[PDB]
Amino acid sequence: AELTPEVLTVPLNSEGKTITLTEKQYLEGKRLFQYACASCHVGGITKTNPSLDLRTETLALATPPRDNIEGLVDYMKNPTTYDGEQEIAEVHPSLRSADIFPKMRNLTEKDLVAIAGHILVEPKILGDKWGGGKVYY
Template identity: 65%
Template sequence: MFKRFPWFSCILSLLLSTALYQPVNAIELDEATLTVPLNTSGKTTILTPEQVKRGKRLFNNTCSQCHNGGITKTNPNVGLDPEGLSLATPPRDNIEGLIDYMKNPTSYDGAESIAELHPSIKSAEIFPKMRNLTDDDLFTIAGHILIQPKVVLEKWGGGKIYY
């Protein structure tokens, strides 16, 4: 059959190779996955696929040295998982809360500024990677952080068990 229809083997090879190289944890980025909390009042926003892609790139370039996989290397008790973000003061489990944190970070209980210890817009002179980030950049980074639990599930912020 392959000798009679040589194009058939090419198509079959293409279909098999495409199926074999799909990421195991890949899920379709549907509207539910792309919908994230905007603020503490319950308002949500839907990220575009472009924002997701850009947020991942910016997160990897700016944040992943200390937060690879949603963990916090300097303090394993505080991660970027939904529970950890929601229990912070103020809550950081929404876009506005994360942007506020990236501009002016505070301790987990919100009592004191940690801008000299944690990269932020406020401390961009100490942390050069923060210098050129715009509000749109911070929005997409926050979006990336918030959709990861939907994409990689319990691995996000799972610590040494997964990373």
């Protein structure tokens, strides 16, 4: 009714294709996002390094584009700075590096796609409350 189909529909590829979505996947998104750890990352900011946020625009300006339901996947699989210059894999949860961050082991392409869709979706509803912290709270 409010969490509508297309409002739950988001960009897939840097090429335009949209994957829409389900109430099921979205949920795993929430369950995940938090379990995958919001511990630094809670709400829509980034406690280890507050300079970078998860707001839609920020992910677009990233390199490579990281607003794609795809993008975030590469990342979670293998991480890269906002340079896309050096792999940040050792300091960031990543399937490339499971042996460091356990929570990242039980993760799957199914589980990923979800935690992903969660990121591109949350802004659509929460508005700015997504990027900002304290201030907007």
